[PDB]
Enzyme design. Structure first.
Site, mmCIF file in Angstrom:
data_model
loop_
_atom_site.group_PDB
_atom_site.id
_atom_site.type_symbol
_atom_site.label_atom_id
_atom_site.label_comp_id
_atom_site.label_asym_id
_atom_site.label_seq_id
_atom_site.Cartn_x
_atom_site.Cartn_y
_atom_site.Cartn_z
ATOM 1 N N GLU A 1 -2.742 3.720 -73.985
ATOM 2 C CA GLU A 1 -4.019 4.368 -74.387
ATOM 3 C C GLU A 1 -3.739 5.691 -75.115
ATOM 4 O O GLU A 1 -4.346 5.893 -76.203
ATOM 5 C CB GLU A 1 -4.920 4.602 -73.181
ATOM 6 C CG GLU A 1 -5.497 3.310 -72.620
ATOM 7 C CD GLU A 1 -6.539 2.569 -73.442
ATOM 8 O OE1 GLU A 1 -6.852 3.026 -74.560
ATOM 9 O OE2 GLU A 1 -6.923 1.447 -73.013
ATOM 10 N N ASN B 1 -14.602 5.589 -82.386
ATOM 11 C CA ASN B 1 -14.904 4.130 -82.411
ATOM 12 C C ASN B 1 -15.819 3.828 -83.593
ATOM 13 O O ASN B 1 -16.543 4.739 -84.045
ATOM 14 C CB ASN B 1 -15.459 3.653 -81.074
ATOM 15 C CG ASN B 1 -14.466 3.859 -79.958
ATOM 16 O OD1 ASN B 1 -13.307 3.496 -80.099
ATOM 17 N ND2 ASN B 1 -14.867 4.487 -78.871
ATOM 18 N N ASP C 1 -18.585 2.385 -83.585
ATOM 19 C CA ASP C 1 -20.001 2.552 -83.161
ATOM 20 C C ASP C 1 -20.322 4.037 -83.074
ATOM 21 O O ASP C 1 -21.475 4.349 -82.723
ATOM 22 C CB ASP C 1 -20.314 1.855 -81.830
ATOM 23 C CG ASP C 1 -19.577 2.422 -80.626
ATOM 24 O OD1 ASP C 1 -18.886 3.428 -80.771
ATOM 25 O OD2 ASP C 1 -19.660 1.827 -79.572
ATOM 26 N N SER D 1 -19.018 6.264 -81.005
ATOM 27 C CA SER D 1 -18.528 6.810 -79.721
ATOM 28 C C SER D 1 -17.080 7.290 -79.920
ATOM 29 O O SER D 1 -16.468 6.959 -80.943
ATOM 30 C CB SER D 1 -18.665 5.782 -78.651
ATOM 31 O OG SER D 1 -17.769 4.727 -78.892
ATOM 32 N N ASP E 1 -13.301 7.978 -77.731
ATOM 33 C CA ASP E 1 -12.459 7.886 -76.519
ATOM 34 C C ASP E 1 -11.729 9.221 -76.323
ATOM 35 O O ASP E 1 -11.186 9.746 -77.326
ATOM 36 C CB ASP E 1 -11.456 6.743 -76.639
ATOM 37 C CG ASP E 1 -12.105 5.402 -76.895
ATOM 38 O OD1 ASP E 1 -13.223 5.166 -76.468
ATOM 39 O OD2 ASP E 1 -11.487 4.610 -77.567
ATOM 40 N N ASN F 1 -14.546 6.474 -72.792
ATOM 41 C CA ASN F 1 -15.459 6.454 -73.944
ATOM 42 C C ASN F 1 -16.812 7.128 -73.629
ATOM 43 O O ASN F 1 -17.388 6.922 -72.545
ATOM 44 C CB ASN F 1 -15.614 4.989 -74.319
ATOM 45 C CG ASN F 1 -16.383 4.808 -75.593
ATOM 46 O OD1 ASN F 1 -15.902 5.172 -76.658
ATOM 47 N ND2 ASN F 1 -17.586 4.296 -75.464
ATOM 48 N N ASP G 1 -16.515 -1.028 -61.642
ATOM 49 C CA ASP G 1 -17.791 -1.314 -62.357
ATOM 50 C C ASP G 1 -17.974 -2.818 -62.589
ATOM 51 O O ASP G 1 -18.902 -3.168 -63.357
ATOM 52 C CB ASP G 1 -17.895 -0.587 -63.698
ATOM 53 C CG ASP G 1 -19.310 -0.599 -64.263
ATOM 54 O OD1 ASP G 1 -20.259 -0.361 -63.465
ATOM 55 O OD2 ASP G 1 -19.463 -0.866 -65.491
#
Ligand SMILES: [Cl-]
Ligand SMILES: [Cl-]
Ligand SMILES: [Cl-]
Ligand SMILES: [Cl-]
Ligand SMILES: [Cl-]
Ligand SMILES: [Cl-]
Ligand SMILES: [Cl-]
Ligand code: NA
Length: 129
Positions: free
Chosen positions: A35, A46, A48, A50, A52, A59, A101
């Site tokens: 990562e 990202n 979209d 967003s 990280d 994110n 989650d």
């Protein structure tokens, strides 16, 4: 801060990640390697819009507030900048909520693609933990 492999393994162990939701320490070290290359200051934008953040690339679409992700949530209740600190506490506490989650570590695409089904114990070999 750029961690050493064993240094991060020790830090993640002290913060309760060792077999958290059944994922052995090597899984989390493997995820951090791919990562962030163990760099707490890693950011990646990202498609979209967003972002990280940090050693586990958490994110802004769900987990932290950066004030530039319209219609996003802040489920860890932290500013995304907290995830960039030399203190991994915010990153680890938020990671525990993510991994709980429903999808476990599959939430980290680089864990599913690069660590899952590999010998992850190699990532902590020769560390004093
Ligand atoms: Cl390494
Ligand atoms: Cl392991
Ligand atoms: Cl926002
Ligand atoms: Cl929220
Ligand atoms: Cl905030
Ligand atoms: Cl720390
Ligand atoms: Cl699981
Ligand atoms: Na957000």
């Amino acid at each position: 801060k750029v961690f050493g492999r064993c240094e991060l393994a020790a830090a993640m162990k002290r913060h309760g990640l060792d077999n958290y939701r059944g994922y052995s320490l090597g899984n989390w070290v493997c995820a951090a390697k791919f990562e962030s290359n163990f760099n707490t200051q890693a950011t990646n934008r990202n498609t979209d819009g967003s972002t990280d953040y940090g050693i586990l690339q958490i994110n802004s679409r769900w987990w932290c507030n950066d004030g530039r992700t319209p219609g996003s949530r802040n489920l860890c209740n932290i500013p995304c900048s907290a995830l960039l600190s030399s203190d991994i506490t915010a990153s680890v506490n938020c990671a525990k909520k993510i991994v709980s989650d429903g999808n476990g570590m599959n939430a980290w695409v680089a864990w599913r693609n690069r660590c899952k089904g590999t010998d992850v114990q190699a990532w902590i070999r020769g560390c004093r933990l």
